[PDB]
Ligand binder design. Sequence first.
Ligand SMILES: Cn1nc(NS(C)(=O)=O)c2c(Cl)ccc(-n3c([C@H](Cc4cc(F)cc(F)c4)NC(=O)Cn4nc(C(F)(F)F)c5c4CCC=C5)nc4ncccc4c3=O)c21
Ligand SMILES: Cn1nc(NS(C)(=O)=O)c2c(Cl)ccc(-n3c([C@H](Cc4cc(F)cc(F)c4)NC(=O)Cn4nc(C(F)(F)F)c5c4CCC=C5)nc4ncccc4c3=O)c21
Ligand SMILES: Cn1nc(NS(C)(=O)=O)c2c(Cl)ccc(-n3c([C@H](Cc4cc(F)cc(F)c4)NC(=O)Cn4nc(C(F)(F)F)c5c4CCC=C5)nc4ncccc4c3=O)c21
Ligand SMILES: Cn1nc(NS(C)(=O)=O)c2c(Cl)ccc(-n3c([C@H](Cc4cc(F)cc(F)c4)NC(=O)Cn4nc(C(F)(F)F)c5c4CCC=C5)nc4ncccc4c3=O)c21
Ligand SMILES: Cn1nc(NS(C)(=O)=O)c2c(Cl)ccc(-n3c([C@H](Cc4cc(F)cc(F)c4)NC(=O)Cn4nc(C(F)(F)F)c5c4CCC=C5)nc4ncccc4c3=O)c21
Ligand SMILES: Cn1nc(NS(C)(=O)=O)c2c(Cl)ccc(-n3c([C@H](Cc4cc(F)cc(F)c4)NC(=O)Cn4nc(C(F)(F)F)c5c4CCC=C5)nc4ncccc4c3=O)c21
Ligand SMILES: [Cl-]
Ligand SMILES: [Cl-]
Ligand SMILES: [Cl-]
Ligand SMILES: [Cl-]
Ligand SMILES: [Cl-]
Ligand SMILES: [Cl-]
Ligand SMILES: [Cl-]
Ligand SMILES: [Cl-]
Ligand SMILES: [Cl-]
Ligand SMILES: [Cl-]
Ligand SMILES: [Cl-]
Ligand SMILES: [Cl-]
Ligand SMILES: [Cl-]
Ligand SMILES: [Cl-]
Ligand SMILES: [Cl-]
Ligand SMILES: [Cl-]
Ligand SMILES: [Cl-]
Ligand SMILES: [Cl-]
Ligand SMILES: [Cl-]
Ligand SMILES: [Cl-]
Ligand SMILES: [Cl-]
Ligand SMILES: [Cl-]
Ligand SMILES: [Cl-]
Ligand SMILES: [Cl-]
Ligand SMILES: [Cl-]
Ligand SMILES: [Cl-]
Ligand SMILES: [Cl-]
Ligand SMILES: [Cl-]
Ligand SMILES: [Cl-]
Ligand SMILES: [Cl-]
Ligand SMILES: [Cl-]
Ligand SMILES: [Cl-]
Ligand SMILES: [Cl-]
Ligand SMILES: [Cl-]
Ligand SMILES: [Cl-]
Ligand SMILES: [Cl-]
Ligand SMILES: [Cl-]
Ligand SMILES: [Cl-]
Ligand SMILES: [Cl-]
Ligand SMILES: [Cl-]
Ligand SMILES: [Cl-]
Ligand SMILES: [Cl-]
Lengths: 210, 210, 210, 210, 210, 210
Amino acid sequence: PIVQNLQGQMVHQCISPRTLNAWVKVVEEKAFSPEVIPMFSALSCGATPQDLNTMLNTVGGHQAAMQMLKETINEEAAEWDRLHPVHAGPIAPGQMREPRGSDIAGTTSTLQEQIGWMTHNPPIPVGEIYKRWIILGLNKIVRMYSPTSILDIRQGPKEPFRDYVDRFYKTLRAEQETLLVQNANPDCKTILKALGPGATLEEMMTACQG
Amino acid sequence: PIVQNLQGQMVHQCISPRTLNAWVKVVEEKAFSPEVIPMFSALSCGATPQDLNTMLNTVGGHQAAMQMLKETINEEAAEWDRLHPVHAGPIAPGQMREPRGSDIAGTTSTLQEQIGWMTHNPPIPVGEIYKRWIILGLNKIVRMYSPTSILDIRQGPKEPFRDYVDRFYKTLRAEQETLLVQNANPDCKTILKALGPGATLEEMMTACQG
Amino acid sequence: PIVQNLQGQMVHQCISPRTLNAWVKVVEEKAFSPEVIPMFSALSCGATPQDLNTMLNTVGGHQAAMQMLKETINEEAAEWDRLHPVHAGPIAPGQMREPRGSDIAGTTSTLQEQIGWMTHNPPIPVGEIYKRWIILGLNKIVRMYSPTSILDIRQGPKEPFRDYVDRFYKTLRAEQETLLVQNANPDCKTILKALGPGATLEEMMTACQG
Amino acid sequence: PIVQNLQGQMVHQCISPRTLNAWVKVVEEKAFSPEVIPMFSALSCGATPQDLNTMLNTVGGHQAAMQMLKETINEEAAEWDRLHPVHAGPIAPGQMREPRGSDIAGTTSTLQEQIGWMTHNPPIPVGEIYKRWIILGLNKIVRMYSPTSILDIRQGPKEPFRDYVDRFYKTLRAEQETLLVQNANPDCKTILKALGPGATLEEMMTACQG
Amino acid sequence: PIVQNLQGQMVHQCISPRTLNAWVKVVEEKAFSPEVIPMFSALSCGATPQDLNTMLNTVGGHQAAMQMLKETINEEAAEWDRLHPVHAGPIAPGQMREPRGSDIAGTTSTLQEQIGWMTHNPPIPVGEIYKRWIILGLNKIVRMYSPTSILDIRQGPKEPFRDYVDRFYKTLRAEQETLLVQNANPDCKTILKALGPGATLEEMMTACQG
Amino acid sequence: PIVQNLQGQMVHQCISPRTLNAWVKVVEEKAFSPEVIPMFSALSCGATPQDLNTMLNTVGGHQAAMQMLKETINEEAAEWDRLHPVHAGPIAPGQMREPRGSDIAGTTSTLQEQIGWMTHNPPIPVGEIYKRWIILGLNKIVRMYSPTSILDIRQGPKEPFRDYVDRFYKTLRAEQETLLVQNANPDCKTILKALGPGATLEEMMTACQG
Ligand SMILES: Cn1nc(NS(C)(=O)=O)c2c(Cl)ccc(-n3c([C@H](Cc4cc(F)cc(F)c4)NC(=O)Cn4nc(C(F)(F)F)c5c4CCC=C5)nc4ncccc4c3=O)c21
Ligand SMILES: Cn1nc(NS(C)(=O)=O)c2c(Cl)ccc(-n3c([C@H](Cc4cc(F)cc(F)c4)NC(=O)Cn4nc(C(F)(F)F)c5c4CCC=C5)nc4ncccc4c3=O)c21
Ligand SMILES: Cn1nc(NS(C)(=O)=O)c2c(Cl)ccc(-n3c([C@H](Cc4cc(F)cc(F)c4)NC(=O)Cn4nc(C(F)(F)F)c5c4CCC=C5)nc4ncccc4c3=O)c21
Ligand SMILES: Cn1nc(NS(C)(=O)=O)c2c(Cl)ccc(-n3c([C@H](Cc4cc(F)cc(F)c4)NC(=O)Cn4nc(C(F)(F)F)c5c4CCC=C5)nc4ncccc4c3=O)c21
Ligand SMILES: Cn1nc(NS(C)(=O)=O)c2c(Cl)ccc(-n3c([C@H](Cc4cc(F)cc(F)c4)NC(=O)Cn4nc(C(F)(F)F)c5c4CCC=C5)nc4ncccc4c3=O)c21
Ligand SMILES: Cn1nc(NS(C)(=O)=O)c2c(Cl)ccc(-n3c([C@H](Cc4cc(F)cc(F)c4)NC(=O)Cn4nc(C(F)(F)F)c5c4CCC=C5)nc4ncccc4c3=O)c21
Ligand SMILES: [Cl-]
Ligand SMILES: [Cl-]
Ligand SMILES: [Cl-]
Ligand SMILES: [Cl-]
Ligand SMILES: [Cl-]
Ligand SMILES: [Cl-]
Ligand SMILES: [Cl-]
Ligand SMILES: [Cl-]
Ligand SMILES: [Cl-]
Ligand SMILES: [Cl-]
Ligand SMILES: [Cl-]
Ligand SMILES: [Cl-]
Ligand SMILES: [Cl-]
Ligand SMILES: [Cl-]
Ligand SMILES: [Cl-]
Ligand SMILES: [Cl-]
Ligand SMILES: [Cl-]
Ligand SMILES: [Cl-]
Ligand SMILES: [Cl-]
Ligand SMILES: [Cl-]
Ligand SMILES: [Cl-]
Ligand SMILES: [Cl-]
Ligand SMILES: [Cl-]
Ligand SMILES: [Cl-]
Ligand SMILES: [Cl-]
Ligand SMILES: [Cl-]
Ligand SMILES: [Cl-]
Ligand SMILES: [Cl-]
Ligand SMILES: [Cl-]
Ligand SMILES: [Cl-]
Ligand SMILES: [Cl-]
Ligand SMILES: [Cl-]
Ligand SMILES: [Cl-]
Ligand SMILES: [Cl-]
Ligand SMILES: [Cl-]
Ligand SMILES: [Cl-]
Ligand SMILES: [Cl-]
Ligand SMILES: [Cl-]
Ligand SMILES: [Cl-]
Ligand SMILES: [Cl-]
Ligand SMILES: [Cl-]
Ligand SMILES: [Cl-]
């Protein structure tokens, strides 16, 4: 990634073995759960487009999702070229050429060019633009691999209300208020209807404790 | 987080994979025990609002508690806007705009803005203000998930006094003096009543050793 | 490797025990899966030819592949000498001699010479030239050890379409569009034929969900 | 803690996840064995009063001992106020207010104030003063939880003298010379009595080897 | 070891616990396999003669090999004194005395003297000279503990050619072309004889795939 | 320990949790094997007398040996006072008082005084003087706990000569040439007697391979 060192300058440093291993392990253990996306954004802090492709390439398996990640990046890269056409001409000394979509994705750009774009003044955050494309495609993967719909998360007759709300918002996070009340069991729904329409979650959970 | 480097300046650095993993593991192993709150405050030392949302997002499951954490942050953010209304006008060069409640929560604020607020002179510790909101909501979660009341922690007839005091103050910490004497078994309560009302814990524990 | 320190200068530092262990473990666990190649490129970030030979030497076993890696490096080193003949003459003060193929492979070159080449102005990235030779030979090993052909990856009658696409592009990555449709089961192929020839993968996967 | 950086100045840095985990694990595995006290003093090297409360708060369970640690800190803090009464008056620029007992314990003091006290010239080591209070209370816990008295550590008829001396000074360390000779078995005590009253331990152990 | 810090100067730093543990573990797990030698050279990067003796001393067991390592170092140290006799005389200020064989082995030399030799201008790499002696003796140990001769590595009638070449060059690496063809089974040797005398390994392996 | 930072000055830094854990684990797993002594010397690189007492205090159990370590340190400290009597008088500004035996052992000396002694010009290496006392006492512990004598290490009738030499020099290292030949079995001793009195170990091991 690009990290500010002891001085104020932004400089490139190699991706650490801990970062490489942490990203590989979180995909092996949690696949494409919703919490894998913010873990990816944190492990790729300040990452160059080369570092982003490194993390995505180290993932063995799940190639159906990774191929869908290819098509999404290609769609976003094509829209970038539609909105930012590169103007031909010799690049002035001390300046950088305009990045294309494939340049932001690290396909037609070198590490030196990515360092120049990200450390420019003003900078061209090609790493954050690429990560924004990857996270978008990763969110489409999480929604596609979401197994349960929010309409099928109903509280059991003996299920504690806390455990049911855990399953409700867990499914809601993968799929990306009153339905929570409607899907409760008859005993708790009677309690929640007498509580008022403007109750908080900690008020609803406290009312249906057992 | 924002860490003072070799020079005196405060600069941003990426959250480490060790910090990300340490927070995820402590929630998997201890859930919402009282000691998870100070562990969260230590792992989020100098954290920006972005780093705080990162730690809260990496938590898979327990979404009922995390959704209650949303409503608490929204309540504290709304009170911040009620006490600190943003005055319109162009921001002077070298200055930062006034943060709103959602800006402190990292919702409508960029990392660059959070760096400017936290490294300002004088600084606006939006990270510590946000963490103070999160810890408050986390304390409400610990009290809600506290299983046992302090009134039901009584010493057994054969239970050693040390083990009973362990259960007493463990429950007392989750729920957030004379009751300790009252809930002791008849043999130790006779000893403690003859010891005096101003005895220390190490004096009470020494008196009921067996 | 060669890492820019606190100052702007590029300086040599020893390869870390974490990097040594991470490369040995990834070969023990995944052998020559496609994702081992980008893991090798990331762990050898900024590596000198000496560090590259170190990583390749620490691999115990798989010597059939490592010997094929020798012949590939020898072929690329011989082509380098054919395109870059060293011109005889005394080396001027502050300058470096022209590297041969065996010099880039770290065979006839010292660490001091590799530091001088990589930190020259302009630099001679003998480490990146050598790594480009190693990755090329490693790609030939992955293709040789690829067990299944893409023609034999067909969807089962009861196999979910997601799992089949996982096996399809996993094999496709090792071997290095319409065939994916042709190798599907009759039920999904009927669905995909009525979808159109320009469908995306997430559209094809959504159409054959079961 | 407060660590001298590259320059000569003392600056604050966040407590590391390794330090947090090392202290939690050593209490889970060894509870209040005598060697836990020096482990606590080493892990809290240069720690601020905030870092000390962090380590003590991350301990789950053993709340009977931790509550006794509260009363000891309160006793030492009350004695500090009895010996160092704070004199009222406006604090001069560049100076710090006089710390109270609760200020040294991190109860009524901010991290900024603790940084100012510990980095003052001359410094006020509120962290070392607080740690001296904690270690004192921790030593009272070790002595209270010491199970065996030194009077009951006697050498068995077939017990090797080395193993018996191991149990002797292990108990002696928890409880905090001739008794070692008296508590030996008749065979070794006959040997030690003929050795002289001024024998060393390695001389006594060598004399009773079997 | 001696590592260049933030400035250009070479300075001594303590050997890390990770380096100490990594060397002890690799000897416990792989003993004296050929890949242990380059692992030793990498873990001892920039090591002083004191650090080299530290790594060799931390090895418990295998003392027969370590004693053979003593005699080899003594032989190389005696040859160094035969080629570099120390000339008597007072050492000038800012200069270092000429190292003997036992000085390079860290036997009659202090750490301060080793720092002065390795950081001299021009430097006397006593650490690299000592490591060159140790690696030479370690190579004699690997050849002595090599169990199988290359003449006894023959391909089985049903053994895949890939697995046989793995055993061939594994044995060849421990012992330190046409024989590979001769030791193949009759079916593959017929294929290799019709392939030509100038075939590569990947051509020979491809020809005998089954 | 005292480590040279980015500048040339020697400064104190806290002992790392990895160093604390590495020393505790090596005593739990290997007790007082000979290789524990050089592991202690490496982990205590640049350690102050306070850090040395920290490592020795974190050892739980083995108190018989640790108490023998007390008496040895007391003997060496008493000899230091006999050879270096402290001359009374006011200490000049910028100077340090003469250390006593208990000052070198960290008993009557503060960390600030130990920093002043070790960073003086010229320095007083009280840490290396103390470590030299500890290693001496640790060597007496290894010899006392050495179970087998070198006279009882004889080669079995069917024992391979390599395994027997492993047991020979392993015992020889704990206890601290021709005997190796005498203690061999009759078959190998006949071979070694016909080899000559000036044979090396690798020659003797090669001659008795089976
Ligand atoms: C090659 N490249 N081409 C693209 N677009 S394109 C013409 O339409 O195909 C494409 C795009 Cl859009 C984005 C980036 C890459 N990029 C990759 C990518 C990363 C990546 C992106 C993902 F979104 C998901 C990933 F997991 C990895 N790695 C690969 O794709 C490796 N891979 N190979 C094959 C196969 F063998 F089947 F072809 C398959 C894969 C993974 C996906 C399924 C099959 N690595 C690199 N390393 C070194 C140097 C440059 C690059 C690089 O620039 C791009
Ligand atoms: C999105 N946002 N919106 C809010 N308030 S609001 C209109 O009323 O809803 C809200 C508030 Cl108050 C605080 C912060 C966030 N914030 C989050 C939050 C963090 C967070 C806060 C918690 F207090 C508890 C957490 F675990 C995580 N992450 C999410 O909330 C992710 N999430 N999504 C859904 C669902 F899919 F169900 F919608 C659910 C969750 C977790 C809780 C239960 C369901 N991440 C971010 N990352 C990247 C960039 C910005 C942001 C961000 O600004 C805020
Ligand atoms: C010695 N050298 N010679 C070559 N070309 S050449 C005349 O034709 O043979 C050759 C080439 Cl092309 C590339 C680099 C090396 N290089 C190696 C190589 C690395 C390497 C390259 C690979 F591509 C695969 C690897 F795993 C390791 N290590 C070895 O080869 C060790 N090894 N030994 C034997 C055997 F004993 F069988 F001979 C075998 C091996 C491994 C492969 C199978 C057998 N390490 C070194 N360390 C210290 C100092 C210099 C060097 C070094 O310069 C070169
Ligand atoms: C709150 N505070 N108050 C005190 N003195 S006082 C009026 O008489 O009670 C007291 C004293 Cl003397 C010392 C320090 C604290 N301090 C603690 C303490 C640390 C601590 C000290 C110990 F010596 C042992 C510990 F483990 C932890 N943490 C707590 O005490 C948490 N806790 N809560 C309860 C309960 F819920 F039961 F109340 C219990 C505990 C732990 C002990 C048993 C019950 N953390 C903090 N974090 C953030 C900011 C400030 C602070 C803080 O200033 C002080
Ligand atoms: C003592 N010294 N003497 C030598 N040459 S000499 C007169 O002929 O014997 C000799 C040589 Cl040539 C090389 C270096 C050492 N050196 C060792 C050596 C390292 C070493 C070298 C190896 F090549 C293999 C190793 F594993 C370790 N450590 C030891 O040897 C410890 N050891 N002790 C005994 C025994 F007890 F049996 F005597 C045995 C061993 C290990 C080998 C088998 C028995 N450590 C040290 N630490 C602190 C300070 C200085 C030194 C040191 O200078 C030298
Ligand atoms: C206290 N002190 N006194 C000594 N000499 S003296 C009057 O004759 O007794 C003595 C000497 Cl010579 C050397 C150093 C210490 N030193 C220790 C020592 C370290 C140490 C040295 C060893 F060589 C072996 C060790 F493991 C630890 N720690 C202890 O001894 C703790 N301990 N306590 C008891 C008991 F409870 F039984 F008393 C026992 C032990 C361990 C040994 C067996 C019993 N830590 C400290 N921490 C904080 C601050 C100062 C100090 C300290 O200065 C010295
Ligand atoms: Cl790392
Ligand atoms: Cl995976
Ligand atoms: Cl794959
Ligand atoms: Cl831009
Ligand atoms: Cl369901
Ligand atoms: Cl419930
Ligand atoms: Cl569910
Ligand atoms: Cl990390
Ligand atoms: Cl969890
Ligand atoms: Cl979730
Ligand atoms: Cl403010
Ligand atoms: Cl109960
Ligand atoms: Cl009790
Ligand atoms: Cl309970
Ligand atoms: Cl490391
Ligand atoms: Cl392997
Ligand atoms: Cl091998
Ligand atoms: Cl070039
Ligand atoms: Cl198949
Ligand atoms: Cl499916
Ligand atoms: Cl398959
Ligand atoms: Cl850490
Ligand atoms: Cl615990
Ligand atoms: Cl608790
Ligand atoms: Cl003071
Ligand atoms: Cl007992
Ligand atoms: Cl004994
Ligand atoms: Cl006992
Ligand atoms: Cl380390
Ligand atoms: Cl071993
Ligand atoms: Cl040994
Ligand atoms: Cl030389
Ligand atoms: Cl064989
Ligand atoms: Cl094969
Ligand atoms: Cl074999
Ligand atoms: Cl550490
Ligand atoms: Cl132990
Ligand atoms: Cl103990
Ligand atoms: Cl001295
Ligand atoms: Cl024996
Ligand atoms: Cl043998
Ligand atoms: Cl034995």
